Write a protein that binds this ligand. Structure first.
Ligand SMILES: Nc1nc(=O)c2ncn([C@@H]3O[C@@H]4COP(=O)(O)O[C@H]5[C@@H](O)[C@H](n6cnc7c(N)ncnc76)O[C@@H]5COP(=O)(O)O[C@@H]3[C@@H]4O)c2[nH]1
Ligand SMILES: Nc1nc(=O)c2ncn([C@@H]3O[C@@H]4COP(=O)(O)O[C@H]5[C@@H](O)[C@H](n6cnc7c(N)ncnc76)O[C@@H]5COP(=O)(O)O[C@@H]3[C@@H]4O)c2[nH]1
Length: 409
């Protein structure tokens, strides 16, 4: 019975890997682990020398991983994402110098770019008639994994009183187990670009379908949002754990609550993702007021992160990042619907690959100027005031783009 065996030995294992690949309990507790008494890094040493390598090496490996993703048929890049995770935690636990943690962010930016591998692995593996049911279970097993990665990381630190050194040994056990699970994934019979079937062309038709889809007003509006707002969003997510260690420094690792602000951000990120399926098609004409109403909210919540200084007001900084990462994930289902509306799969993986590359270009520019010790070397509180201005400048562009479009004659 190959029908029932493919839903109990393949799909049930596919939603078991995607659950077990996204479980790293010490992933939110990386920056408190570096700044704590285990590694003894200065706060000005991981915000100007370690974390800007996460933005540089992401630019360097975004194109070679995406080309190796479709060439190797998506399975060894899920093994490369698993092996780079093990190589990140083997540098957290064993590396001590400032150069080893720059190598840790090089292996962490591999996993950050090879994350799409799994989301495009399901498209090339399962049949198109039964894709929206398998990918519906697969994303609901990843999102259940990301939630339980930050809950299990929080319950061990807070309830279990497990220190950060023993937590990363636990996270190393869930990552060596996810390498073993990634070895038994079935390679798809076909890929999207380099291993297609039925080999007018795949490049002459794609550069003509792009020429008739680049003139859509809803594609240029949401690709320009994906370049600039998704780059300033990821500049907050990298540097918000160095800011929570600046607001409330403890070295008392049972009151950190970086997993409770990474599980409630996934839970709010799943609610606002679910609540954007109605607005995705309903609020498409008012698509610049929707960007300039959320980016103005993100310009306030980033400024709220840069303004709190008392250690008793740290729970405002958690609720100004859960609301920040929750309001960004409201716009992404609206963004991926308006961009990938009339686009073929071969072009949807190219437009979102160009949008993620141009976001990483304009993230590398801000990380070299504002964040790195070569450009300016600004501390994290004097850097979030430059991301709140960047979000406010971005918010009064879509709002002034809405006055010049709504009140246009
Ligand atoms: N409701 C909803 N529909 C979407 O299409 C979508 N795409 C992203 N998101 C969420 O918004 C944020 C944007 O991160 P980015 O997309 O740049 O990195 C993404 C992206 O590079 C990759 N990825 C996720 N889904 C896909 C997908 N369908 N196809 C290709 N790549 C994907 O894996 C990373 C993490 O995604 P999620 O951790 O599941 O939630 C994301 C994320 O929190 C979405 N939320
Ligand atoms: N909750 C949730 N989280 C997600 O990450 C996600 N990704 C897609 N979906 C929805 O499930 C279905 C799967 O379509 P597929 O993903 O193969 O094409 C997707 C996907 O390949 C691509 N894409 C979406 N997000 C990203 C992303 N972050 N990065 C690169 N490519 C992406 O653009 C297409 C548009 O999908 P949406 O029209 O926005 O809703 C999808 C869709 O209904 C998601 N739902």
């Amino acid at each position: 019975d190959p029908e029932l065996r493919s839903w109990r030995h393949l799909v049930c294992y596919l939603c078991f890997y995607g659950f077990m690949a996204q479980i790293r309990p010490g992933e939110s507790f990386i920056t408190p682990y570096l700044l704590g008494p285990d590694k003894n890094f200065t706060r000005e040493q991981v915000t100007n020398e370690i974390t800007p390598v996460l933005s540089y090496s992401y630019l360097a490996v975004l194109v070679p991983v995406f080309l190796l993703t479709d060439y190797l048929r998506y399975t060894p890049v899920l093994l490369l994402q698993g092996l780079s995770f093990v190589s990140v935690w083997l540098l957290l636990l064993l590396g001590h110098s400032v150069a080893h943690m720059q190598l840790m962010e090089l292996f962490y930016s591999v996993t950050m770019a090879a994350r799409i591998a799994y989301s495009s692995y399901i498209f090339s593996l399962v049949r198109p008639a039964r894709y929206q049911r398998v990918a519906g279970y697969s994303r609901a097993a990843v999102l259940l994994g990301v939630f339980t990665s930050s809950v299990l990381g929080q319950l061990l630190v807070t309830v279990g009183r497990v220190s950060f050194s023993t937590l990363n040994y636990i996270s190393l056990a869930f990552l060596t187990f996810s390498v073993v699970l990634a070895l038994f994934l079935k390679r798809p019979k076909r890929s999207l670009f380099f291993n297609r079937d039925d080999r007018d062309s795949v490049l002459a038709r794609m550069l003509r379908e792009l020429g008739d889809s680049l003139r859509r007003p809803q594609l240029r509006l949401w690709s320009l949002w994906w370049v600039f707002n998704s780059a300033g969003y990821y500049l907050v997510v990298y540097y918000v754990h160095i800011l929570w260690n600046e607001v409330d420094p403890t070295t008392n690792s049972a009151r950190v609550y970086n997993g409770a602000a990474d599980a409630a951000s996934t839970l709010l990120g799943a609610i606002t993702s679910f609540a954007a399926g109605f607005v995705k098609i309903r609020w498409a004409r008012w698509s610049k007021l929707l960007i300039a109403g959320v980016t103005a909210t993100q310009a306030g919540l980033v400024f709220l992160l840069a303004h709190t200084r008392h250690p008793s007001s740290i729970w405002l900084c958690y609720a100004a990042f859960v609301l920040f990462r929750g309001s960004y994930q409201f716009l992404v289902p609206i963004a991926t619907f308006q961009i990938a509306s009339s686009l073929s799969k071969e072009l949807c993986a190219l437009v979102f690959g160009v949008n993620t590359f141009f976001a990483t270009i304009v993230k590398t520019i801000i990380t070299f100027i504002v964040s790195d010790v070569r450009g300016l070397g600004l501390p994290v509180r004097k850097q979030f005031q430059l991301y709140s201005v960047y979000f406010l400048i971005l918010s009064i562009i879509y709002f002034l783009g809405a006055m010049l479009d709504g009140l246009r004659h």
